[PDB]
Each structure stands twice: as structure tokens, then as C-alpha cells.
Amino acid sequence: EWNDILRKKGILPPKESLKELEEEAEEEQRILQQSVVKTYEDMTLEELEDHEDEFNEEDERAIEMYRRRRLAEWKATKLKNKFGEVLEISGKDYVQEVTKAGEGLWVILHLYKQGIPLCALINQHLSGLARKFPDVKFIKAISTTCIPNYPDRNLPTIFVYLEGDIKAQFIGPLVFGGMNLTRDELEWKLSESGAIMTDLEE
């Protein structure tokens, strides 16, 4: 009564506010439910192999167009699978790959001294990663011949380079310390460098 008369006249009490927030949130919640079916035919590339449970009609215009774009995508992605073995170049050439390493290609510049299970396990993880991402340039070597008399208490130091610009750093075991460190966590860190797009729990 009196409060709503106040409301017509004044705004001294606030009580009619904030009832639009949950309204808009629920609107968007109902809206975002059509994204599952919007791209049902626009994601899978095996739907042709999924005959008799995916076909209702074929317009042969946008769907053959989908095959065309899909095959272009496939050829573009499989023309780049050239790697998969971490390689040991020498320090003499080092200037030629710190700089002349290709523009638009990430370089995981790994430096290490073999012998500690830290460096050994890190080398194992990156070598196994090479089996998954053959589109990434891996480099392994002895830092002593890469950097003269490099402090041996600063290994293994991960370097992320492209066009001579350091984008990501992971210096020493201070960020990799522990035998509990695993495959997916390394992949997670290199994804966080901005090179890879994947998903992990933690």
C-alpha cells in the first residue's frame, strides 16, 4: 500500500529492482539449448560413414559443399604432419634455428643435462608428445654446447620461441619439480603457452 504509493511518487525505499537479472539469465539459458542441434551436421566428419542413422534427405548442395570444405580442412591439416621425433642439433648451428625456424610455427626449445630423473622424465614426456603433435618443432641438446658454461642448477629449462620472441618461459625444475609430473600436465602447460588447444581437468 503505502510503500507502492511511495514508489509511484518517490524512490526513497528500494524494493523493486534486480528482478531482471535472473530473468535475462534464464532467457539465455533457454537460448543456449539450440547450439547442440545447430551444428549436429556441422561437426562430425564421419556422418557419411554414419549412413542409415544420419540420413533423412540429401539436398546435395550444402552437403556436398560440406564434403568439399571438410576435405580441404583434412588435406590442410594432414599436409603438416611431418614431426614426431625430438632431435639433437648442435650448438654450432644454433643461431640458424633460434632465428631461421619458420614464421607461424611454434618451437619448443628444450635445453637439458641428461642424468637426473627430472630431465629424463621431461625428455620422455616431450618425446611422447611428439607422437601426438607432429606439427610442433621439438629441439633437444646439451645446454653446455648451446650456452657456454651454462649453470647446471638451471635445468631443465623449457623455452618457447617463435620469430625470436620468447612467448612462454618455464625455468628450471622450479615449475616441473616432482616425479609425479605427468603426460597431460606437460601438454596442459604447452597448451597454456598458446600453441595447443585441448582440455584437461587440472
Partner: protein, 354 residues
């Protein structure tokens, strides 16, 4: 009808309006026919019959009321309940006299009116809290609890801002160039509306305005001169608080307020403690609030707390209160209508019961 005979004005709109449409200064259509020209100029000639908070004439009020909403408001009050204002305090005689004229010349269905203090309290959005009705010519204390003004709790004090200006010009002769003429009274009031603030107190303000002279404000005015050392400005509020300045030595206004609150039960005073809003009429400058706060805090027990409320604009406050009460949606339970007017006359208005 949201017409309200204020302190000197009558403002006519509707309950749902945000403001009255017409004013009451006590050639829109005056070049087409001139029918209303004569009526409105004649009503304009008639004066304001209300002074000091009591009605003083009766023929002129109805004379003005007839025209004021029969020639511009364009309303038939026979088909409308009526809501006017009234002088701050009157005995039942004026109320039951006005009922007679209203009915006998308009026969409007129902009525209700209330004291201006209640309208101000509603406008500020309160149903509780005593307001300092520092009206022109005379001030009054109206402690309002739930809306109805207590007939046993109204106090009236003769202080006025006119009196403050007069006392200033009674100690402005001591300032050298005195001020008494109409122009000089006007310039004293102008300076008062420019600077008569309160910091804490008389002697300490005068020391900081004379020993260090850092409270001086030079008056570069066509009608003014640099004749104030910071004394005369603060010399207006002081007599507002300390009676012996004016030569009429009595108790302070704070004493009157304190007694008018203490005579009631202590519990309800808590609610009166709650808001304790103020009103203008003689006060327009800050420093009033905290000063009276601490001054009555001397009179207020430290175990209980006190609040001070003062809105900056209170010009249509009575009109706002009237508009709110016109839409309260329960005030019709207290309408006094023909069903009782033609049954009992003015006797029920007198509260024959109790």
C-alpha cells in the same frame, strides 16, 4: 481536488498529478472574451485571510474558492471528495464553521483535512517523529505518532525569523551603519540568506572571527558593504538559540521540545527519537542540525541515542503529503460525509464520545 491553502498560497491540481496546475498569487484567455478576466482579477484583489496559524476571515476564503476551481480547474466538487489544508492549530470552532459553509454552498460528498505538520511528515516519508514547525511569525512543536497530531502535545513559541532580523538590526546599530528601512531590512535578510551559519557556539565563533579574523567575508554588493567581521552572520542564529539575546529571557526551544517529548510515555519517545525531523520557515542554513543535536544531547541521556533529519527542499511538502494521503487507500475509512453531516451536524466533529 488537491488544493492546499499553504502558508500564503493555494495550489490546485489533482491527486494523481505530479504538481498543481495553477498557483495562488493572492492574459491567457483575457483577450478572447474576458469573462474570467474580471472574476480572476477580482479574486486577485482579495487578500490572504490567514495569519499566525489561525483563520481570521471567512467570506473571502469561500469567495476565492468558488472562482479558483470554477473558472480554471474546471471541476464539479459535488462529484468529488475534498482535501484542503488548514492553519496549523485551531479549536474545533473553525473546523465546524468551515464544514457548514462547505456543505451549504457545495454539498460535496466527503471531506478530510490534516495539520500541515502531518503533511510534511508524510512528504518526508515518515509516519513518526516530531517536526520543529519553525513557521513564519511563530513556531510550534507537533509530535506525530502514526499520523494523528496529539491535542495535548502542541506547544507554541513566539520566535520568528522576522524577530531575528529585527534583533540583528538592534545590534547592527552597534555595528556603526545601522539598517532599518525597507531596503535596509531587505538587505539584512539577504545577507542572512547568504551567510548566518553555525559552527559551534557564540564566544568561540566570535574569537575566531575577531582574534584571528579568519571568519571575515567581504561583502562586495551593490546593496551591501564589508561591515561584517564574521560576527553579524553568526549573530543571527545565536538569538535563535539563546533567548536572552533578544531581551525576552526565557527557556530555550530545546527545553520546550524536551518537555513536550518527556510528558509522553518513554516508549513512544523512542519512535520520536527515531527520526526527529525538522522543518524550515525560519531556518535555512546548516550548522543548525549538529548544534541542536549536541545541545539537546546535553539534555538527552547518554544511554539513549538521538537522530537529526533535515531535507534541503520542503516547499511543496504539504502538497506531497496531501497527494500521498489522497492515494493512501485507507483514509476513506475516516471520511466525514453527508451520511453523518446531515445526521448529527457538527456534534460528531466535536467527539461527543470519550
Amino acid at each position: 481536488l488537491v488544493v492546499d491553502n499553504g502558508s500564503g498560497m493555494c495550489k490546485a491540481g489533482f491527486a494523481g498529478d505530479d504538481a498543481p496546475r495553477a498557483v495562488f498569487p493572492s492574459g491567457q484567455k483575457d483577450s478572447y472574451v474576458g469573462d474570467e478576466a474580471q472574476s480572476k482579477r477580482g479574486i486577485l484583489t482579495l487578500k490572504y485571510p490567514i495569519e499566525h496559524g489561525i483563520v481570521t476571515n471567512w467570506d473571502d476564503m469561500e469567495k476565492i474558492w468558488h472562482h479558483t476551481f470554477y473558472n480554471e480547474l474546471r471541476v464539479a466538487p459535488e462529484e468529488h471528495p475534498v482535501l484542503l489544508t488548514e492553519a496549523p492549530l485551531n479549536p474545533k470552532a473553525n473546523r465546524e464553521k468551515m464544514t457548514q459553509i462547505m456543505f451549504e454552498t457545495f454539498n460535496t460528498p466527503a471531506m478530510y483535512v490534516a495539520i500541515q505538520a502531518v503533511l510534511s511528515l508524510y512528504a518526508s516519508g515518515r509516519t513518526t517523529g516530531i517536526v520543529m514547525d519553525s513557521g513564519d511569525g511563530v513556531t510550534h512543536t507537533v509530535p506525530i505518532y502514526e499520523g494523528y497530531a496529539l491535542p495535548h502535545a502542541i506547544l507554541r513559541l513566539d520566535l520568528a525569523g522576522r524577530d531575528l532580523t529585527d534583533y540583528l538590526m538592534k545590534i547592527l546599530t552597534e555595528r556603526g551603519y545601522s539598517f532599518t528601512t525597507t531596503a535596509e531590512r531587505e538587505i539584512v535578510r539577504d545577507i542572512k540568506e547568504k551567510l548566518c551559519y553555525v559552527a559551534l557556539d557564540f564566544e568561540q565563533e566570535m574569537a575566531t572571527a575577531a582574534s584571528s579574523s579568519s571568519l571575515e567575508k567581504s561583502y562586495e554588493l551593490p546593496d551591501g558593504q564589508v561591515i561584517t567581521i564574521g560576527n553579524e552572520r553568526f549573530r543571527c542564529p545565536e538569538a535563535l538559540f539563546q533567548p536572552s539575546f533578544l531581551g525576552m529571557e526565557s527557556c530555550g526551544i530545546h527545553e520546550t521540545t524536551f518537555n513536550s517529548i518527556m510528558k509522553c510515555d518513554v516508549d513512544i519517545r523512542k519512535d520520536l527519537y527515531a527520526n526527529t525531523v525538522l522543518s524550515g520557515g525560519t531556518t535555512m542554513y546548516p550548522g543548525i542540525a549538529d548544534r541542536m543535536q549536541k545541545e539537546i544531547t546535553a539534555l538527552a541521556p547518554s544511554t539513549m541515542k538521538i537522530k537529526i533529519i533535515a531535507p534541503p527542499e520542503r516547499k511543496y511538502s504539504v502538497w506531497i503529503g496531501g497527494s500521498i494521503l489522497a492515494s493512501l487507500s485507507t483514509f476513506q475509512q475516516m471520511w466525514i460525509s453527508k451520511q453523518e453531516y446531515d445526521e448529527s451536524g457538527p456534534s460528531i466533529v466535536h467527539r461527543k464520545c470519550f
